[PDB]
Amino acid sequence: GTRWAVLVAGSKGYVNYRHQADVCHAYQILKKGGLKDENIIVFMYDDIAYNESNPHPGVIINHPYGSDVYKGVPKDYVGEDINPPNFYAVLLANKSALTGTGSGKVLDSGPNDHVFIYYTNHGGAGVLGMPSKPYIAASDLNDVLKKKHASGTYKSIVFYVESCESGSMFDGLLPEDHNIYVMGASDTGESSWVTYCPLQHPSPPPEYDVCVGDLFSVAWLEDCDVHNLQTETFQQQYEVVKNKTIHVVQYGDVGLSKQTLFVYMGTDPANDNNAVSQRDADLIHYWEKYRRAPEGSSRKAEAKKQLREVMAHRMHIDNSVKHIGKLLFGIEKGHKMLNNVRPAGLPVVDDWDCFKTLIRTFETHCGSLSEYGMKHMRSFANLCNAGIRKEQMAEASAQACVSIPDNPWSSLHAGFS
């Protein structure tokens, strides 16, 4: 049987160069390995290669001393077409439910085929980021994987995930008897990290404004760059990635971790037998953009405005969420309800319908959480688990947070995360 791959970069903007650059790198490894373009579905917002802020138009790098990885990478789903429905339809091999200028390439696999799913962006508590709202909820995701299993159009599925709280997407949801092995960068309650930033041990070329790669991703991308894939098992790769960090989780059928990396990816002429927070990295870019601009320049003026708009939004969202906590529970016992971690083995939330309505009512009074407010998704999760209903949140979210601030990230134009 054939070997497929689904690669997903859940972010947009030059700031998040790293996520697309990872996906590009991933395609290069698979191409070298021998997988056919026709079986590699690429979701990437095509806005980094030819960005105005890119020093080297047409090239993307995933390493300080790297060369290009962008050339020849397919563009199946780009721009606004990267939405969960398309991703879900692409997973379920349903071409009749795509929307946009997509390629039509789907996971039309059979029961002898192996699939390697890769997604990096980003993420929050039971939610992965996408470049076009709404985002991917864990309930919706696992329902699709449950349907795919029922259809029996795959033997094995390795799913690698680079996002904050990435364990929370599967923990208490993904069954272990479905031939789906997961390798997350973080557990339910922890951040993912980013390497190769402007000021670091392995700093990228000085012309670069941004971090060029994520830590967990880069870890496994390097391992599958210079190693025979017939002499290395997924369990080994897990150990390798683990040693790169300063938790790497695995979920689902961990029985599949005994297989080699050749069954999904491919080894070429090799024959060689076997960092900062994601949210905190975005600020490096803005500060540097405003810290590397000529004084009294238009760039400096815009860079400074962008930076003020970012900081203002993060302070706004944090305050609002904190305040709503104090309005629902108390000032000294409200902090705990929001910042709580549920015992390992349970889902993030029981009532997902509630989950979404709470986030939406928060947004209809406060605005949008963007990609920075995903930090507080667990807070909303905990509220739905505490038994808070729309009528009770709506009162609380209107009292703290009466004004939606005039920020570009607080806009609701095609919003409601």
Add this chain to the structure above:
Amino acid sequence: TRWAVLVAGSKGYVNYRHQADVCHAYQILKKGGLKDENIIVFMYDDIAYNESNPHPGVIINHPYGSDVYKGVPKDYVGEDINPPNFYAVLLANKSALTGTGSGKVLDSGPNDHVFIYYTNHGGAGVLGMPSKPYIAASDLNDVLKKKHASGTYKSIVFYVESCESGSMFDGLLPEDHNIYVMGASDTGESSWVTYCPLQHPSPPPEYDVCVGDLFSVAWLEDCDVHNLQTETFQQQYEVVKNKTIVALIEDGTHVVQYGDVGLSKQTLFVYMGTDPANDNNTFPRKAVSQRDADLIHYWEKYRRAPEGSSRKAEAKKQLREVMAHRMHIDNSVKHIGKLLFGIEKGHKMLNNVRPAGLPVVDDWDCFKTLIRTFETHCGSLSEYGMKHMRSFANLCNAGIRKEQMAEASAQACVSIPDNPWSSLHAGFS
């Protein structure tokens, strides 16, 4: 006798810059031969043994520099650095001093020369002090007018490192009072800072802050390694003018000279001293704005702190508090401008530059009252809101009164933000 008055108008580890300059200045004068008894040092003693200092007991003013803190006198430290004390020290009036001061004053006569150097930061015709209130140009120049009348000095060189430093003397300091001035910036221009964490000449990596100001450093290095008998003040001016490499890069920021410029023909030996050097004068230095330099330190203090640590949490909080206060002040001032004049013609009134030769303001009594009424509704301007002192100046010149300002400053800015820089505890800049 040769006297000197050094002033470091600021406090906090952020402004390591300013005190490090004053330390360097004392070292030059000491080597040059001036007696401690005739060197009055105003420095808020909070840098040498700060918790954020990687090398306790040492201050540096150069990336490859060694200590300049050792042996520097401490005449006025802590909260005693206020304009009344500075003014009493200038007028040799020990009877009007408040605090744990040394009591050292400018008890000079008509054959004496004095070198006054103050750096911090500064606004439109006002210099920063470490404890509010600040030094207003009107009050400063009145003291220099009083000193001249007493006839207890031959010549006074006054060096100034602050934003809009020209505004302190422009249209106020008379040119026949034997006072020569050398500002770092003219009336409407910022001063700059070199030797920051990420620069051409970056300081030792353990350092978290810029260690020196551009203008100050320029003349300090010149008086470090030259025979002061073979170099005049005009030459030093030309030296410093070349050292500022931002003159052509950015706007304004022209090194300026006010008062009796005739005195610029004297040698630096009359005010300073030249030790074993004998180097007859002959013939990149990258740098950032003063208000911008402060952000380098906060960001760097939050970008180096270990993730999920106490430091990070506090560095992050401090950074949010700074950014929030700066956004607040800017908004409020801009808002009051649209309320007083218009939305499209109110921006020009606030950001105006008066023709060279005129003072910043005509009515100084009004000037202070407008700042105060803005502060009684909005909070304090701290050291960042000195950027809008010219705005208030333009309002006083546009014929705005307290009653009109109080209404406008109450409608824009109804709340005082709960920020540490918005506090009024011993405030009212």
